[PDB]
């Protein structure tokens, strides 16, 4: 059916095409793998300009029609989903592999038999790493904090953020400690509001121990800040999801008014009814009101006179963070108030911003709440929007370290240990699986080599050194002098990649290969 507008590919060409298509996607992003990497301006068809060293993000934005690329688009994506840092690299390794696989094919090898070869050599490397890796959690407490940081830092060196990487790193380290527990080892990112606004530089990007939100503070006359109300236990605040307006049904209405009788009673009904709420909150003994939905002109004024700063309209996730931040309860009706369901926050101020007529507000807490707000700032949108994703990247590497305190020293060395170990087992293999193992390990070598290429070092050169040194001594961790400094040895240099991620990466590529190779037939149609 639909015979026309339908093409077919199969091996002679086909495989070349695919292999090459991968390779080419790669050639673009290879120049972004490294602490010497570079970003790529991507533009939405609408006109949105972005700038980012993030792998996944780049390949998602490249509006591309080649089917194989479409696959590497997800390859970098899936990895971003599972870890949060692989992206830029997972594809590189994948391509290299493909070129390698292809190469063998023109020497008489079966595509599917290479597949099994790679899957095997891979599983081995994963092990030769799973054995050489080091542990952090089980070693110290002040050193865990350090190592956990020394990763977040290394994880940021390939970003514009790099400039102030000290702060951005210690920020990501903190942001995670404060919302996940050593036992559950679960970092729920809903407990971390990644909000950013413009202004200053990326340096003025602090971490807030509460939340932000945008509010003018209901009535203008209202105060700007909020003290702990004399000797009290910090500040108490109302967290209600009921509107400061006369209660209404939820089924019908038609309050039939026969005569001036009842209309006379409604009259005074709404009137004091506003006092029925304004009083209600005073009774629970609170300082400031945070209502999910707006208030009436009357009800507002009262909140003024009664020194009850208010917050008209606050979104779901919004109101909710104000709870968990201040330890309060989300109170339905008005009469459901009480001094014991209030929010025990530590301060509230209406934050100014340059001359921007916006001027949002903030809710602090002093002590590490169960909610953090990394509030990012920058000289221009793109710097921010990149710095936020840059922050995110690190925050993820911090989450992976609690979910698996295992660490491997990157700098390319992590990939050299495999290439070394996997290549050894090659000589023992002999025959066909010999070519596979050699290949797998050989593709790997492109990872460090690429780092050398970007940092300005002769590839073959740094590789022989990295291989020799990491053999003439111990299948340890000797990385590339990516920036300079004394010499190799990612350890001293403090270059660290979480193991858990590295495994995922060196899998996701081989697997993706294992799929493409099995494809020997293709049938594309058009858009009728």
């Amino acid at each position: 059916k639909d015979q026309g507008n339908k093409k077919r590919q199969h091996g002679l060409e086909a495989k070349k095409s695919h292999i090459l298509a991968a390779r080419s996607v790669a050639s673009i992003i290879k120049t972004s793998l490294g602490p010497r990497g570079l970003d790529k301006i991507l533009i939405s068809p609408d006109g949105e300009i972005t700038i980012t060293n993030d792998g996944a993000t780049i390949l998602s934005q490249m509006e591309l029609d080649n089917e194989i690329a479409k696959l590497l688009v997800q390859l970098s994506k899936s990895q971003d989903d599972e870890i949060g840092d692989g992206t830029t690299g997972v594809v590189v390794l994948a391509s290299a592999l493909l070129d390698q696989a292809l190469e063998l094919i023109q020497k008489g090898i079966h595509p599917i038999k290479i597949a099994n070869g790679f899957d095997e050599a891979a599983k081995l490397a994963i092990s030769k790493l799973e054995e050489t890796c080091d542990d952090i959690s089980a070693s110290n407490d002040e050193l865990f904090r350090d190592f956990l940081l020394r990763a977040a830092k290394t994880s940021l060196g390939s970003k514009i953020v790099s400039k102030d990487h000290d702060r951005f790193a210690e920020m990501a380290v903190e942001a995670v400690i404060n919302v996940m527990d050593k036992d559950r080892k679960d970092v729920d990112f809903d407990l971390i509001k990644m909000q950013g606004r413009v202004g200053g530089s990326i340096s003025d990007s602090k971490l807030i121990n509460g939340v932000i939100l945008d509010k003018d503070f209901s009535h203008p006359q209202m105060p700007k800040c909020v003290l702990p109300k004399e000797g009290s236990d910090g500040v108490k605040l109302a967290i209600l999801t009921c509107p400061f307006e006369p209660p209404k049904p939820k089924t019908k209405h038609k309050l039939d008014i026969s005569s001036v009788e009842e209309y006379q009673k409604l009259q005074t009904y709404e009137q004091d009814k506003f006092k029925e709420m304004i009083d209600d909150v005073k009774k629970a003994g609170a300082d400031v009101v945070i209502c999910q939905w707006g208030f009436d002109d009357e009800a507002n004024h009262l909140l003024l006179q009664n020194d009850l700063p208010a917050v008209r309209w606050v979104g779901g996730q919004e109101l909710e963070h104000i709870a968990i931040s201040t330890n309060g309860r989300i109170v339905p009706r008005f009469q459901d108030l009480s001094k014991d369901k209030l929010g025990t926050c530590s301060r509230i101020y209406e934050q100014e911003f340059g001359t921007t007529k916006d001027r949002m507000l903030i809710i602090e807490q002093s002590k590490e709440t169960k909610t953090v707000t990394c509030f990012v700032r920058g000289s221009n949108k793109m710097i921010v929007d990149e710095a936020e994703r840059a922050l995110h990247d690190s925050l993820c590497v911090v989450r992976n370290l609690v979910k698996d305190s295992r660490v491997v020293y990157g700098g390319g060395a992590a990939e050299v240990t495999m290439s070394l170990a996997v290549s050894e087992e090659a000589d023992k293999q002999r025959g066909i699986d010999q070519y596979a193992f050699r290949g797998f390990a050989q593709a790997l070598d492109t990872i460090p080599m690429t780092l050398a290429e970007n940092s300005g070092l002769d590839p073959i050169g740094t590789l022989s050194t990295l291989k020799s040194k990491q053999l003439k001594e111990k299948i340890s961790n000797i990385g590339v002098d990516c920036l300079g400094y004394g010499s190799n040895d990612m350890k001293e240099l403090f270059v660290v990649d979480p193991f858990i991620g590295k495994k995922q990466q060196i899998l996701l590529a081989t697997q993706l290969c294992r799929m493409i190779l099995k494809i020997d037939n293709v049938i594309i149609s058009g858009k009728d």
Partner: protein, 517 residues
Amino acid sequence: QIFGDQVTEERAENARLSAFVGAIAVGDLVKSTLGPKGMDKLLQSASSNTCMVTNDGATILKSIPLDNPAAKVLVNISKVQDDEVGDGTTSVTVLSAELLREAEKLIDQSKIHPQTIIEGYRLASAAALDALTKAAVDNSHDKTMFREDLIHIAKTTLSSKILSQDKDHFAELATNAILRLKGSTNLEHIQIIKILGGKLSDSFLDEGFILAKKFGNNQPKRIENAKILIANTTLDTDKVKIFGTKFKVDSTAKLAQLEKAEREKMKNKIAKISKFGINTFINRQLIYDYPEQLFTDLGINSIEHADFEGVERLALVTGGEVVSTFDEPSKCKLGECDVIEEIMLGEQPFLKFSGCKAGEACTIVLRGATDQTLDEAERSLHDALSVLSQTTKETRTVLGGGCAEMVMSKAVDTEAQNIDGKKSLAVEAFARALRQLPTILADNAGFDSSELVSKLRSSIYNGISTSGLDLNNGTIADMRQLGIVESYKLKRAVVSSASEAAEVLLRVDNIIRARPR
């Protein structure tokens, strides 16, 4: 293959160019809109008949459509700088761009890696930005001196614009208008009202606050020792929020009852208010014919419709509080002033209040011979109100007219003495680009810029760190001696906000446009 349907890729050489050209291009658009001897550019939008002339950098850039990323990056950097400090909008793009220009030099013809060019800049920036703080003297204390300081900032932040003419005049206006608040950095408290006719020098700041909208049906055309109740409450059919209240009767008479019944609610609420003892009632909301008649007959003047901002202004000059609950007089700060007379501003009715309780809300009336002149004098003023508004929230100050950046030049050009190899070059380049500011400044005036700036840099080189460019005799006189102060936040912002621009761009090694829809 890959990609498709009009997506466009620019690799290394190409990308880098796209970028560099863009920024350089943007910069070379607003270089003329700098310097006290600078010029304006006329522009016109989708309506054609919507021209406008301006010297505001950020203004021009915000408008001018572009397709080039690197350019939009610079445009955007301008709007940012325009936000957190209201000024320097131009000085920033230019210095930002010139830094990139100075970079493609270190690349295309020196062969230095951009990352190493960043390495150097990042250092140069530290040193540059530093020397600023390390040389910025302030007058936070001595409120009678900082007045003189602050007034200079306006004096010079106004040169270059049309107002540069009667700059001395607007100098005071700005200063005074900000001080009359002394606090709120929110400039929405000062209302600017403009009307054609006569010289700009005729503009003024009514220290009594003027307001639009006349009062009452035909009330007293002038109040005396006014005691005003500033309020915002529903004034056309109440029942506030009981919605659903139907009136089913079995005869028209029972309607007629309920009808006058409603019109009673009004005489009720209107009464609870009269109990506040006031000779003027201003409501944000409106007030229909009847609820007004009440006032016209009680002597209380009804001045309706002043939105939100319109009340907040009055509530800061008169000293009252918004209010919407008259459920009890007192406990409601009532506002007051000396007179609420109705004046006429060239064919127009206005309300000149007078002697208010320390007006922390004011009105500046601008007068130009053409709408163009007004609308430009509009922001040309805003460029003053904004800095000053910030310097009260940042007392630090530094001398401009070249001086400032020229000092940061000698700073960087110095710290470029202790450095590695290649990096140094970027560092030297920084100070170089910085130096291009006084150059471009002097250029516009018309002097042999090269020659003049080299004289300037020479003084600041060999000590002094005070000389600047007298863009009139075309000599290099002492700036502190000539009242050419500039906000520290401003200059520090430019030297910062720009360096960020640079880094974000130098780091690009590819550009990809998608299939525009």
